[PDB]
Amino acid sequence: SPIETVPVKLKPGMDGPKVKQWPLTEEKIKALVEICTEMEKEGKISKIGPENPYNTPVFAIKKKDSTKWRKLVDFRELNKRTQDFQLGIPHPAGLKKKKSVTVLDVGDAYFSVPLDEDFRKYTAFTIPSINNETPGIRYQYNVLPQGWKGSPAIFQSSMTKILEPFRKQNPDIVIYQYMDDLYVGSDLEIGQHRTKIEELRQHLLRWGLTTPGYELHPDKWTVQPIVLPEKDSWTVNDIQKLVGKLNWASQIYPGIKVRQLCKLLRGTKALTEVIPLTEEAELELAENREILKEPVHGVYYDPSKDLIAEIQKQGQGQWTYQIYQEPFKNLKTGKYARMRGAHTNDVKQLTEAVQKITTESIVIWGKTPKFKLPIQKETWETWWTEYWQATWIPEWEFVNTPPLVKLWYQLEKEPIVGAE
Amino acid sequence: PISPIETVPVKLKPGMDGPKVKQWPLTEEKIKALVEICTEMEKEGKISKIGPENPYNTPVFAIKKKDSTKWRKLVDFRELNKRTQDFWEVQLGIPHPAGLKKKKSVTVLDVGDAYFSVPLDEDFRKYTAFTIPSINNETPGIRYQYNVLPQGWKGSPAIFQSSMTKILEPFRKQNPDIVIYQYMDDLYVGSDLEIGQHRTKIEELRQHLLRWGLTTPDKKHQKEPPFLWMGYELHPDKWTVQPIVLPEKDSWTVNDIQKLVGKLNWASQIYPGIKVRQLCKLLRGTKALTEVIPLTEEAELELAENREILKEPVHGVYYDPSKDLIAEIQKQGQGQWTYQIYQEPFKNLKTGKYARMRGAHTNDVKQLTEAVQKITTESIVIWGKTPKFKLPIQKETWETWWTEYWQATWIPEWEFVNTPPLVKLWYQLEKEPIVGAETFYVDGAANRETKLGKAGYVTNRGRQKVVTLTDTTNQKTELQAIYLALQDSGLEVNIVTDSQYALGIIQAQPDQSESELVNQIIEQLIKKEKVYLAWVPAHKGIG
Ligand SMILES: CCN1c2cc([N+](=O)[O-])ccc2N(C)C(=O)c2cccnc21
């Protein structure tokens, strides 16, 4: 059941992806074998030969509140190589401000639509076999693939139409489509928001596709200030600690000064030695607390530059991050506490963290950050998919955290009591 | 015999044209032969004669195959092979014996010259053109081309594999209790049927392929268990490690030693205990690959003790899916771990070992963590599942290290096994300053260019010292400053430094490093009862 197809092409000069398949467990090779025999039936994919040398990784995951396996392909490479593109998908600035937002899985839609014959080859993928006892089962897409960037592109039209009536009949609501999802935000209280969302599904369901606490709460995502400690009496050590912090911090705020405190620090005294503050030290300090009570002036997001997310493990289940484009000019920053139950594992906590942060990036600038992760590649590659639950996959690099950038953010402020 | 199978479409690499190489001159014998041989496959429809409308050419050769004083042929597809497109993957990686399940019987079928069984995409056939000249280079040479996949051509293995897979699909569907695995030109079939039955099915399959032109070999030579499958001696019920023969010899060359250490190293995976430390020494300063070296007696005693290890042969067991997988690890030394994966104690499926070149800065636990991880990946490649781990480290120790370490890290479900020696935390820097302990303010500087420095400290207790260093560097100096404070300090010490590198240590708390100097510092850290190390920015007032 095809239509006339829009020709897609690789950016000029590029060649298709030839990425290697990561080894998978029994459990998921089975699940994908099933998933694929079915889709093959429904004409969505088609077996291929050896004459086709391209490949893209695949794997399976289950969403929380999902106990039915879902096939997820890694198209990052294809996407990078895929030409950019009348409906082209623009990002509003309203859901940043909404009282609540709701993400909806509309990946299903694409499978209806055929994909140009000559771009099919580039979508080759492989289900590998245990202990390499068998060759892999190679397939390729005949319809629009989920998680590919061309997909919400091409299904743009159909989508605008499908929606307009909910749109025009409710312009007090925002709808954002970022790949396989639709973010639906409203200020209306939960009653009307939940109920109006359900209605929206029905609106979608009605046209074909099934489209499936959990609610989001934008700009409740405030950036926190760095608060500095306070003691009755300070020791040589507290000052040294405090001073090393500020000296570095002055790369962000150039008005932070450390000379009057450093003065008290001349003289080979014992770390546990208590030192009273000279009235000149006392003010310099009070003067730093102020500069620190707010984010640096001048940081403006630039659409044509990559967004960057850095995370630092803080121990005890905690993590801190910063989104920015230029080092020291952060657009947003925050603290994340481990999800209930991830009490024995870092990779779990970290992927959850990455997912939440990517989401917010999407809501705010409709773009995924490139991540800098405090983890060894091997450790990440071996177990990231185990806990992944999002249709998209952001870019990443593995790094080593400078000890200083860690001490600084630990200093971020927290609720006096919490949220209750 | 050719077959009625769909040809796989084949094209030359982006913008390239077929081969065009000249044909060597040949003896009366090497021409006579090839003329006989080609007329043969010529009659079999395997190769066809071509005229002058083909500008291409590949060099045909003639070599009398060993143990046949008769003549055979060889076409040199090097160049064509360069110009041909790429295919996905002929031989993903090798299946490992420990990942097979036992079968009551295993039979192998030689689908031998079955490359000449599958037909070649009609269009591509032209690139395969070749010439058989004549005596005095008269006028023409006898020209031909392959109508079938040629032995040697880049694409043959892949196409031949996909073809055979199609061809076996129906048989495979009707007989899911039977197992087939193709590798090269060998069909390996196995099952748990009663033997008569198994015998029957093979004949069946033999008739099936036969429908497709693919003929099978004479009774005069069919292969039988055990099967030599690259390194192992495979039996349907157990696998065995094939013989590793160390040439006992008179005089030894550098090269010979290299090959020797090569083999011994492959060996250690299955036979840990094998060692090569002294044998490696014989290499230091070697001037030629063929210079003879005197075997130090430390080297005789070691070369000896290894012939003994390689005496006791080894047999393993195959995988049973109804059982749990157990991976046990042991630290043989600093940066050396050994492991064995088994299902039923003492019945090993697989074993191996790892040497970890200290590199920058690590610690034993981090190192354990990488072991587990390397093991975890190979288990998934082999049995699609990860082992329950029995590890030589206390749950207390691990919890302390990981909850605080700066990098994200993890170890799959595991259990402490009290097999000495346990991996432990060599030292732990205190979190706050120590009361009733001396405080050394250390500092060190060097002139980058002259490599002249000083290192020293002064304490809150009045003590002081300073040293002058020649041929040093800044980091060394700063480090040395720290070394001295450690040396002259006593059981509990507070130490302040403005060193960048000190920040690294405070963070990572390594227990090994590439630096002999950092290492000296570490030995020192270990001896102390309590150490609090602190950093202050450089060149500010603090001192
Ligand atoms: C079942 C056939 N066979 C076997 C399987 C295999 N694979 O799956 O990759 C590779 C080799 C192989 N060979 C040669 C055997 O002798 C064998 C022995 C025991 C069980 N299966 C064996």
Curated annotation (Swiss-Prot), chain B:
Signal peptide: none annotated. Changing L92I: Confers resistance to pyrophosphate analog PFA. Changing R211K: Confers resistance to lamivudine and zidovudine. Changing Q161L: Confers resistance to pyrophosphate analog PFA. Changing G190Q: Confers resistance to efavirenz, HBY 097 and nevirapine. Changing S68Y: Confers multi-NRTI resistance. Changing S68G: Confers multi-NRTI resistance. Changing V106M: Confers resistance to delavirdine, efavirenz and nevirapine. Changing T215F: Confers resistance to zidovudine. A motif (Tryptophan repeat motif) lies at residues 398-414. Changing Y318F: Confers resistance to delavirdine and nevirapine. Changing G190C: Confers resistance to efavirenz and nevirapine. Changing L100I: Confers resistance to nevirapine and efavirenz. Residues 434-543 form the RNase H type-1 domain. This is Reverse transcriptase/ribonuclease H. The gene is gag-pol. The chain holds residues 588 to 1130 of 1435 of the full protein.
